[PDB]
Amino acid sequence: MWVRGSGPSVLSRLQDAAVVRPGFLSTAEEETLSRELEPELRRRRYEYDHWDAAIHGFRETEKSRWSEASMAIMRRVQAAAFGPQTLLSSVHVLDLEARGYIKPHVDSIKFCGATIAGLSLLSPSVMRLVHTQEPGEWLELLLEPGSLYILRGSARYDFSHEILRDEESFFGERRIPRGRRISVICRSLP
Ligand SMILES: O=C(O)CCC(=O)C(=O)O
Numbered sequence: 451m452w453v454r455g456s457g458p459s460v461l462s463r464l465q466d467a468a469v470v471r472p473g474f475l476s477t478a479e480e481e482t483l484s485r486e487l488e489p490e491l492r493r494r495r496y497e498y499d500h501w502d503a504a505i506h507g508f509r510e511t512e513k514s515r516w517s518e519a520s521m522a523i524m525r526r527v528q529a530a531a532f533g534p535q536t537l538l539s540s541v542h543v544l545d546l547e548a549r550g551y552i553k554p555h556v557d558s559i560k561f562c563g564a565t566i567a568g569l570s571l572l573s574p575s576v577m578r579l580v581h582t583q584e585p586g587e588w589l590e591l592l593l594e595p596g597s598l599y600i601l602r603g604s605a606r607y608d609f610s611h612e613i614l615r616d617e618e619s620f621f622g623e624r625r626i627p628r629g630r631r632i633s634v635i636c637r638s639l640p
C-alpha cells in the first residue's frame with residue numbers, strides 16, 4: 451500500500467489522477483542520478499526560510515543539460531507520465547534537509563501545465579493531498595526512494611500537496627523517518 455484515502459470516494463475519483471509507481475528507478479538509475487546532481491547541489495547554500503514560502507529547509511537548481519544516462523531516465527518519465535504534452539525547458543531538482551518539508555500548495559497554474567511527475571531519491575517521505583475546499587477530503591502517498599509519483603487533473607488542480615515534516619511524518623499510523631531528500635520534478639507547460 452502506497453496510497454491511503456480519507457474514504458473510497460476520493461480514492462475512486464483520483465485512482466488515475468494521483469499515481470505512484472514504487473520501483474520506477476533501478477538502484478543503478480538512482481545512483482546515476484545521485485552522482486550527477488550531488489556536486490551541482492553541494493555548491494549551493496540551503497536557502498533562508500520564509501514563513502510565507504511553501505518550501506522550507508531547501509536548496510534547488512533548474513537542470514536542462516543531462517548526461518546520456520540521466521537523459522534516458524527523463525525520457526522514461528516523459529514516456530510514462532506525459533501524453534502525446536510538452537515539457538518545460540528545464541527540470542526542477544529539489545534538495546530538502548532532514549528538517550526540511552513542504553507546506554500545502556497548488557503548483558502555479560500560470561507556469562505549470564496539467565501534469566506534475568516527480569522522482570524521489572535517498573529517503574522515504576509522505577505527500578499528503580488535501581482538497582482545497584474540503585479539508586476532510588485527502589489522500590496520503592508513500593514515496594520511497596526510486597519512486598515516481600504522477601499528479602494530474604483533479605490531483606493537480608483541486609488538491610494541495612505537501613511533503614510532511616519529520617515530526618508530522620506518518621503514513622497512516624506508521625512512522626516514516628525523514629532524512630535528506632533529493633527530488634527531480636518534471637512539469638508540463640500550460
Ligand atoms: O519533491 C516533490 O515532489 C515536491 C515538489 C513541489 O511540490 C514543488 O516544488 O512545488
Ligand SMILES: [Mn+2]
Binds near residue numbers: 510
Ligand atoms: Mn532558489
Ligand SMILES: [Mn+2]
Binds near residue numbers: 556611
Ligand atoms: Mn508543488
Ligand SMILES: [Mn+2]
Binds near residue numbers: 623
Ligand atoms: Mn490502523
